[PDB]
Each structure stands twice: as C-alpha cells, then as structure tokens.
C-alpha cells in the first residue's frame, strides 16, 4: 500500500521501482495585466521520475506549448504526467519496466492508475514521506536544460553522479534528500555551501561537486546545520 518510515528500506531492494514527482510539471509566474487584473504566464516544467536504487533520473521536460488552448491546467497537468510516465514504461523493455511506481502526491494515483490499466501487475503507490523533490529545479544543470527547451524533450542524468561506487543506494538517497531539503529550505545558503570552495569543481556532467568522502561528511553536516538554522529562524526557536 502506502510507503512510509516503517517500510523505508524497500526502496533499495532489487524490485525495480520509480518515484514520480509532478510538482514541477505546471509552473507559472503570476503578473498584473495592463487593466490591473491578474494573469498567469506558464514556463517550462518537468516530470521528475527517479529510480532510487540506481539514481537514474528520467527528466521529461514539459514545454509550455502543451498548455496552449487547454483549460483547467492544474488538473490536466496530473493527466499529462500520467500519460508521459505510461509512455516511458511502454518504451522500456519488459525486464526494465518497474514493478511499482510511487507517486509523491496522492492526486496522481487515479490519473496514473487509469493510464496504467494495461499494466495490472504494476503497483501504483502513494507515500507518507514528505520528499523534497520539488527542489529539483534548484539543481542548476536540471533547471538549465528545462528552461532552454524549445520543444518536448526527455533528458537522462544520474542524480547520484558516481556516488554508488563508494556508498550504498540507501546512503545515496539519504544524501540526495538532505541536499534537496536544504536547497528547498534555503537555496542561497545551500548553494553557497556546495560551491564555497573553488578547488572542488562541480564536474561538467555532475549536479554536485567531486567531494571526497571526508568532504561529504563536512558538507552533510553543514546542510543539517542550515536546515536546523532555518528551522530556528522560521519558528523563533
């Protein structure tokens, strides 16, 4: 059924699964019109579809043209997400298709269930975890490819870089969620922490630097401090 803290380790077993986050599919800026009314302008978005065991991020870029002439866009966005995830599953060989898809928001259950009726053996699951995947657009290279897109496009990045050569997928997911939680709570500071040392380069093909094991410990501690810091600033603690 639902994915929570009791069954957290199931994410890293050998049954293929994907997380789907739709919080950046339909993105707008709100502005005033010449007549003093309010209007929205859509900007490019993305579906965040992640294998938490391997780090494979299948980033489907949602170009603003898909909204043209459509109504009820927040509702359409959930069905467009489900359509694209179903299309991705069908494109994958049978032995690569997921056994479970975990949606980060419960409003995705029915749209994805309906689009996946042809796959009765794939379980569609919600989660009780509050995952910080909305902050994926705070990863500079991901935000860049989304904003530059002139047409629908799928892009592939490993969201763990080469970490799995040295750590397990449990630890890698934990690092990722800590980095994203920090970028979500204070993006400026988080980015300051990550690139304050010009000798650790963010490598061309990597989202975060080439930190050594010891440097990741320092980074991870600085990120917890930031999260705790912001928690205190927020709540006056």
């Amino acid at each position: 059924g639902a994915m929570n803290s009791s069954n957290y380790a199931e994410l890293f077993n050998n049954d293929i699964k994907l997380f789907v986050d739709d919080t950046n599919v339909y993105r707008v800026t709100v502005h005033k019109t010449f007549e003093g009314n309010v209007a929205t302008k859509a900007i490019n978005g993305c579906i965040f579809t992640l294998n938490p065991k391997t780090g494979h991020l299948f980033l489907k870029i949602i170009h603003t043209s898909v909204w043209a002439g459509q109504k009820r866009l927040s509702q359409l966005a959930k069905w467009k997400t489900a359509e694209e995830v179903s299309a991705l599953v069908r494109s994958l060989p049978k032995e690569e298709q997921p056994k479970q898809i975990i949606v980060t928001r419960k409003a995705m259950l029915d749209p994805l269930e309906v689009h996946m009726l042809d796959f009765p053996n794939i379980a569609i699951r919600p989660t009780e975890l509050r995952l910080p995947f909305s902050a994926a657009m705070s990863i500079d290279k991901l935000s860049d490819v989304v904003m530059k897109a002139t047409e629908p496009q799928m892009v592939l990045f490993n969201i763990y870089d080469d970490w799995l050569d040295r750590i397990s997928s449990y630890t890698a997911f934990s690092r990722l969620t800590l980095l994203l939680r920090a970028l979500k709570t204070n993006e400026e500071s988080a980015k300051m922490i990550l690139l304050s040392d010009p000798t650790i380069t963010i490598k061309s093909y990597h989202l975060w630097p080439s930190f050594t094991d010891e440097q990741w410990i320092t980074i991870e501690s600085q990120m917890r401090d930031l999260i705790l810091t912001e928690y205190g600033r927020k709540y006056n603690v």
């Binding site: 359409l76 069905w79 489900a82 359509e83 029915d110 749209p111 269930e113 309906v114 689009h115 009726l117 042809d118």
Partner: protein, 300 residues
C-alpha cells in the same frame, strides 16, 4: 387479482409482500395473501422470529404460473413452489378464501408506490440476474454475493448484475483516459446502454431491482450495484433528457419508500453528495434533491 396460498405457517415469521410487512405467530391459521395486483412483479419475503439472520424471499409474476408457499422443516425455510394442476390450485384457493384464512394485499387506490418502484422491472430480466432456470420465480437472500463481489464464492448462488468498474479497460478508451474518467458518457451511452443493456428501460430495471433487493433483504452487494448505476449516470455529461427526468422520478420514489431508520445501512454519503452537489447532473434531479434534503439532511 391473484393469490399465493400457504400450506401452513409452522414457525413464527414476519412476512412481507412488496412494501408491506406483517407478523404470523407460530402455528397461526395463516393460509396466504389474496388480491395481489396483476401486471407487476412482486416479492414475498421472510424474516424468522427466532433468527432474524438470513432474510430471504421470492420474486414472482402471477401471470407466469400458480405459486404457493410451503414450509420445509428439513431446510428450515418457507419455499415457493409451482402447482401445475390448475384445478387443484383453484380449488385450494377457493376453500381458503371461503374460510377467510388469507390476508388481503392492501392496495390503497390512490397509491402508485409499487408501480413506481417496479416500472421497468421484468421477470425475464430478474431470471437472468438470478439463475435458477427450472423455476419461474427467483430466490434472493441477504447473504447472496454479486458476480463483482466474487471477482474481488459459489457461482450458482450469485447475483449476476452487470459489472460496472470506473477504472477498467471497459470504462476507459485508450487515448481518452482523462476524458473518459472525468466524463463517463462513453461508458454510459456506448458501452452500457447501446452495448450491454440495449435501452434505458433495461438499465433502469436492473437499477430498480438492485434497490429493492438491497432494501428488502439488506443485501450489501445489491446496494453497491444501485449506487454504481446512479453514479454512472450522474457522472456523465451527456445523458438523454428523458433518462434524467425518469431517473429523478425513480430515485424520488425509492428515497420516499426507504425506512427512515435504515438510511445509515442503505445510503452512501459519498455517492449522494457527489451526485446531488458536484456531478454534471447536480441540477437535473430536482425531485430527488428536494426529498433527500428534507428527509435525510444529516447525510448531506
């Protein structure tokens, strides 16, 4: 006017005939119900005094044969039987009427309630939902499960209602997923009406039969069927005007007849609030919405 004689009443039982219920005491000189209106299906149903478990009963149409009730002390229930000897039957009834051993179907003349509850219900369609082809009447009890319930266990004893599943490949056209899920008109009009039921009368007949089974037997599966068939119409943006007007009348009389004190065991809060207040047809069921709001405003 037709008659269903009883051989005897050896165990204390509440007997119902359509919307009327009455008590028969153990070994009371009861020998049936006379003056049953011709032209309608009817249901004669039972709840034993010593075990209110298993309400059960029989759907029948006196035009299709001569039927009587006889208690079976081995299987412990009142059974419907057909008498093939016409002159034997007429002679039996006449003696029981002369001795005034039969209660009278008490049809008030102003009253169209039973017609309005069974307008589209036909014996031939009942007998396809309830499969026991050697009899002209159909047995139903509270515990019988529907074909759907058994997909999700004895098939000879099932209620074969038409399966209605909103998240099913039958309900959803490849490539129209959002369209078909949010507006169920394709499923209602093409799959169900044109395809399975053939016409709205047959659809309403199954809807009305499901309600009556749910209310008279407290059959949970029947209740699920009734609400599913309501929701399918209310959740369709394109419904013929005559179907909406007839549905409003059908539901009005069903809600009017429901025992006030069973509205917790026969009415689904989600379906009714959705149907009356959120659905495409939220404004098309004026009679049903008014009686619901005045009779069961808690549920809403």
């Amino acid at each position: 006017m037709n008659t269903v004689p009883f051989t005897s009443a050896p165990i204390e039982v509440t007997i119902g005939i359509d919307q009327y219920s009455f008590n028969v005491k153990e070994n009371q000189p009861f020998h049936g119900i006379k003056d049953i209106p011709i032209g309608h299906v009817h249901v004669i149903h039972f709840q034993h005094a010593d075990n209110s478990s298993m309400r059960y009963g029989y759907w029948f149409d006196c035009r299709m044969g001569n039927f009587y009730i006889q208690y079976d002390p081995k299987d412990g229930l009142y059974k419907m039987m057909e008498e093939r000897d016409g002159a034997k039957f007429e002679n039996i009834v006449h003696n029981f009427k002369e001795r005034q051993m039969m209660v009278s179907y008490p049809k008030i003349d102003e009253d169209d309630t039973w017609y309005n509850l069974t307008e589209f219900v036909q014996m031939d369609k009942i007998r396809k939902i309830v499969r026991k082809d050697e009899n002209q009447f159909s047995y139903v009890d509270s515990s019988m499960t529907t074909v759907q319930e058994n997909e999700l266990s004895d098939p000879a004893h099932s209620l074969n209602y038409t399966v209605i599943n909103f998240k099913s490949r039958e309900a959803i056209r490849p490539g129209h997923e959002m369209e078909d899920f949010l507006d169920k008109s394709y499923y209602l009009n093409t799959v169900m009406l044109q395809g399975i039921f053939k016409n709205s009368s047959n659809y309403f007949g199954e809807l009305q039969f499901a309600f009556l089974n749910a209310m008279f037997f407290g059959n949970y599966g029947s209740s699920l069927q009734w609400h599913a068939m309501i929701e399918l119409i209310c959740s369709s943006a394109t419904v013929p005007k005559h179907m909406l007007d007839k549905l409003d009348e059908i539901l009005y009389y069903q809600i009017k007849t429901l025992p006030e004190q069973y509205s917790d065991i026969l009415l689904n809060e989600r379906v009714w609030n959705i149907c009356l207040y959120s659905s495409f047809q939220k404004n098309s069921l004026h009679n049903t919405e008014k009686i619901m709001e005045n009779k069961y405003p808690e549920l809403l």
